[PDB]
Amino acid sequence: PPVYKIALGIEYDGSKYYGWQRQNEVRSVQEKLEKALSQVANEPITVFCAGRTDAGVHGTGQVVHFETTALRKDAAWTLGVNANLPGDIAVRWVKTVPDDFHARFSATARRYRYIIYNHRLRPAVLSKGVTHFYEPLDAERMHRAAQCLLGENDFTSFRAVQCQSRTPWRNVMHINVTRHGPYVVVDIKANAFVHHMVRNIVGSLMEVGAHNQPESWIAELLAAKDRTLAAATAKAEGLYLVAVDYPDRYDLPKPPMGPLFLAD
Amino acid sequence: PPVYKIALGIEYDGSKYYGWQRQNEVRSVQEKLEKALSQVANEPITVFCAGRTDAGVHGTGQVVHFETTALRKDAAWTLGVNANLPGDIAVRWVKTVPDDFHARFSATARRYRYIIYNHRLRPAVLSKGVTHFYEPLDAERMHRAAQCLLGENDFTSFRAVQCQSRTPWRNVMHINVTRHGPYVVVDIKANAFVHHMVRNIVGSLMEVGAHNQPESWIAELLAAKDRTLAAATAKAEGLYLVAVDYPDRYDLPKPPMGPLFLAD
Ligand SMILES: [Cl-]
Ligand SMILES: [Cl-]
């Protein structure tokens, strides 16, 4: 019998999990998703994701694929999986895909949104889904300071010591910093990311926005190539994986990025 | 020695509490806030709220007052109090007020926003802070159908049986329904509300918006004076107390209502 390969759009609140990746030590998003899919499929299912997210990080645009011998209507993979999942994980859509699709290796870019709540006093609504930053932030100054990161660049100054890639070079396709009321949102897209690149970049933009560092400091850090000179890694709770690019031949759905009320 | 009367703006995620009031409940917002204030004041503190909220309901614009013999700087009533509160409750501001102020009796109106997530599939991010409604809604149709609620009206058809008020008559100051992407937001302001009035109005508005009841139905239910004819009470999860009106002489802070990214 045929082995079907299926892609899913997954959303999750990452606050009650210890990251995406399944392992034998702590609760993960992947384990809950695999248990729900196996219930529907009536066999053990293994999923492969576009981008693993660390503990506390959320997703609206995560994509996975899996193989199954189970033939089913689209309802099974959407309503059925969601009925079996906890309330903080959900399928957004299902698409059957060709055998040559791979949620990680077919992807050509990933995009993240980082949500900062900027006030002296901490927030209570979505408290583990926003990062509280105490001192006032100048979002326009952060925006202008971030534009130098566009294109192919050596991201050694924003790279964690644990990254195992052998090159620190990546291509940032866009970067935007905007204020929405008391919130400051960082939107960044690249082909791929070195370990903790997004949160490292946000951590330093935060020092520029608070006026602890100049507007040209990001250009300066980039040029100086040393992660010890850059700001501490920003907290996990404001980060969302919001979109993954794939070739148009796969025709995957593209529902709103969000999180929540933000526009595409 | 003076007795000081202090007002605070309070925000809370209601999902882990069984409503505001501590009476008859193991888990309440009021208990947590009174424990926090008693520790800062070094004496037992009792707070009085502008509008009690039911189990699961949220607040961004709640206001309380309390009396204390403790003379403290504004930081103790904000940072100090927040240090003694759980992560899902927070003080937004402090203001000393005259003796004649009462968070309930000085208020002239309360305003709520109700957030509906209107996709076929349920959400995962902010799952206990939005109401999932699976049938497609026509927000403009809901808006038009709601306007007959304006002004002084007998809200019998939208009142729960547990309401003990004399008169079911209240004054609806405004009501609007707008779509924001996949979300539908009901914004309603009245001098005061009867029990379950907001959630009962929203329940019937969603039936109209889904084309299950005619656009005239809200006016027909209003005139019928029988809550058994009206739709089921909408879920608590999407409801937020976002603002309370007080006379200008009190000069109370008016920070963003949200929740989250919604503009004022
Ligand atoms: Cl990161
Ligand atoms: Cl209500």
* Contact (Cβ atoms closer than 8 angstroms) between residue A87 and residue A35: no
* Contact (Cβ atoms closer than 8 angstroms) between residue B179 and residue A257: no
Q: Does A61 touch chain B (CB under 8 A)?
A: no
The residues, any chain, with a CB within 8 Å of residue B197's CB and separated by 6 or more, are B155, B158, B159, B170, B190
Q: Does B187 touch chain A (CB under 8 A)?
A: no
The CA-based dihedral angle spanning residues A65, A71, A72, A76, taken in that order and rounded to the nearest 10 degrees: -50
* Contact (Cβ atoms closer than 8 angstroms) between residue B233 and residue B57: no
Q: Measure in Å the smallest separation between the Cα of B263 and chain A Cα atoms.
A: 7
3-state secondary structure of B227: helix
B194: left (phi over 0), alpha (psi -120 to 50) or beta: beta
Q: Tell me the sheet residues that pair with A111.
A: A189, A243
A48 CA distance to ligand 2 middle (Å): 43
Output the six-digit token pair for B219.
């006016």
In a 10 Å sphere around its CB, with 0-12 CB exposed, 13-18 middle and 19+ buried, how is residue B17 labelled?
Answer: buried
**3-state SS track over chain A:** CCCEEEEEEEEECCCCCCCCCCCCCCCCHHHHHHHHHHHHHCCCCCEEECCCCCCCCEEEEEEEEEEECCCCCHHHHHHHHHHHCCCCEEEEEEEECCCCCCCCCCCCEEEEEEEEEECCCCCCCCCCCCEEECCCCCHHHHHHHHHHHCEEEECHHHCCCCCCCCCCEEEEEEEEEEEECCEEEEEEEECCCCCCHHHHHHHHHHHHHCCCCCCCHHHHHHHHCCHHHCCCCCCHHHEEEEEEECCHHHCCCCCCCCCCCCCC
A136: left (phi over 0), alpha (psi -120 to 50) or beta: beta
Output the six-digit token pair for A174.
């866009």
Rounded-to-integer distance, Cα B106 and Cα B128, Å: 31
In a 10 Å sphere around its CB, with 0-12 CB exposed, 13-18 middle and 19+ buried, how is residue A251 labelled?
Answer: exposed
According to the annotation, is A183 in a ligand binding site? no
Output the six-digit token pair for A34.
């695999």
Output the six-digit token pair for B201.
């109005």
Q: Which of B63, B56, B14 is nearest to B242 (CA)?
A: B63
* Contact (Cβ atoms closer than 8 angstroms) between residue B112 and residue A246: no
DSSP state of B209: H
Alpha carbon separation from B173 to A31, B109, B139, B147 (Å, rounded) = 49, 8, 20, 10
Residues A177-204: b if buried by 16+ CB within 10 A, e if exposed? bebbbbbbbbbbbbeebbbbbbbbbbbb
Q: Measure in Å the smallest separation between the Cα of B62 and chain A Cα atoms.
A: 12
Record: contact B126-A260, CB cut-off 8 A: yes
* Contact (Cβ atoms closer than 8 angstroms) between residue B160 and residue B233: yes
The number of angstroms, rounded, from the C-alpha of B105 to the middle of its chain's C-alpha atoms is 16
Rounded-to-integer distance, Cα B223 and Cα A146, Å: 59
Q: Does B15 touch chain A (CB under 8 A)?
A: no
Rounded-to-integer distance, Cα A54 and Cα A1, Å: 37
Query: 3-state SS of chain B: helix, strand, coil percent to 5?
Result: 25, 25, 45
Q: Where are the beta strands (DSSP E) in B2-150?
A: 4-12, 48-49, 58-68, 89-96, 109-117, 131-132
Q: Measure in Å the smallest separation between the Cα of B117 and chain A Cα atoms.
A: 9
Phi/psi at B64 (5° precision): -125, 165
Which bound ligand lies closest to the C-alpha atom of A159?
Answer: 1
Residue at token pair 């933009």:
A205
CA angle B142, B147, B148 (to 5 degrees): 115
A144 CA distance to ligand 1 middle (Å): 21
Rounded-to-integer distance, Cα A208 and Cα B178, Å: 37
Nearest to B121 among A90, A258, A259 (CB): A90
Q: Which helix (H) or strand (E) holds B74?
A: helix B74-75
Q: What are chain B's domains? A: 1-107 (3.30.70.580), 108-245 (3.30.70.660)
Number of other residues whose CB lies within 10 A of the CB of residue B125 = 23
Interface test mutation site (partner A, options B53, B118, B121, max chain A beta carbons within 10 A) = B121
The CA-based dihedral angle spanning residues A28, A30, A31, A32, taken in that order and rounded to the nearest 10 degrees: 90
3-state secondary structure of B2: coil
* Contact (Cβ atoms closer than 8 angstroms) between residue B5 and residue B99: yes
3-state secondary structure of B52: coil
In a 10 Å sphere around its CB, with 0-12 CB exposed, 13-18 middle and 19+ buried, how is residue A243 labelled?
Answer: buried
Record: contact B82-A121, CB cut-off 8 A: yes
CA B208, B212, B213, B214 torsion-angle sign? positive
Residue at token pair 């082909």:
A191
The number of angstroms, rounded, from the C-alpha of A97 to the middle of its chain's C-alpha atoms is 23
The residues, any chain, with a CB within 8 Å of residue A7's CB and separated by 6 or more, are A63, A64, A65, A94, A95, A96, A97, A101, A103, A250, A252
Q: Does B17 touch chain A (CB under 8 A)?
A: no
Q: Which of A84, A9, A85 is nearest to A241 (CA)?
A: A9
**Technique used by the depositors:** X-ray
Phi/psi at A154 (5° precision): -80, 110
Rounded-to-integer distance, Cα B72 and Cα B45, Å: 14
Rounded-to-integer distance, Cα B251 and Cα B61, Å: 15
DSSP state of B97: -
Residue at token pair 């999407």:
B238
In a 10 Å sphere around its CB, with 0-12 CB exposed, 13-18 middle and 19+ buried, how is residue B68 labelled?
Answer: buried
Q: Tell me the sheet residues that pair with B184.
A: B116, B179
Rounded-to-integer distance, Cα A42 and Cα B263, Å: 47
Phi/psi at B130 (5° precision): -140, 150
**Amino acid type, B128:** K
Number of other residues whose CB lies within 10 A of the CB of residue B122 = 19
Residue at token pair 């007002």:
B7
The residues, any chain, with a CB within 8 Å of residue A81's CB and separated by 6 or more, are A8, A33, A36, A37, A40, A91
Number of other residues whose CB lies within 10 A of the CB of residue A141 = 17
Rounded-to-integer distance, Cα B178 and Cα B188, Å: 12
Rounded-to-integer distance, Cα A132 and Cα A121, Å: 8
